[PDB]
DNA sequence: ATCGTCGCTGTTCAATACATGCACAGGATGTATATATCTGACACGTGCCTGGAGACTAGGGAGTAATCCCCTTGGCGGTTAAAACGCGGGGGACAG
């Protein structure tokens, strides 16, 4: 439903193949797992244990 | 005796000197700017030629319609795990 919502803002009356959604979910979770890995490394660098939004913002800024 | 005055002292009060917190001139070191000067890299002009333009053909790639059926959407209900809400406190964040 979320992907249909985001796509609805681009073009109306669209149908999705089930495999297309699964591929979007696979790449999305892999991106999010990789981001939290970089986020946890940033939080540990700040002598912390808890991840915080400033860690994600710094990580994505360095990533470009 | 009896009173007053003169040697011996402490205790407080005031005045002065010192120490600590704060701002404002004063210099010097760098930056910005003003100026003179000389330069070589850019812009133009010329001359020369290779790649773009023109004209035609042949041919297959793409556009077009007509049919197919596969895939996508959709609705429905049933247990069911996962989400959600709340509580309590501990250890992790954050500041000194």
Which percent range describes the beta-strand content? under 5%
Largest sheet: none
The shape is elongated
Succession of helices and strands: HHH
SS class: mainly alpha
Distance between the termini: 29 Å
Features:
mainly alpha, part of a larger assembly, 72% helix, 1 chains, epigenetics, 3 helices, histone modifications, DNA-binding, nuclear protein/dna, Histone H3, 64 residues, elongated, histone demethylation
Task: Describe what you observe in this structure.
This is Histone H3. Residues 1-62 form the Core Histone H2A/H2B/H3 domain. It is found in: Chromosome; Nucleus. Belongs to the histone H3 family. The nucleosome is a histone octamer containing two molecules each of H2A, H2B, H3 and H4 assembled in one H3-H4 heterotetramer and two H2A-H2B heterodimers. The octamer wraps approximately 147 bp of DNA. The protein has 64 residues and is mainly alpha-helical. The protein has helices at 2-8, 18-45, 53-63. It is built from 3 helices and no strands.
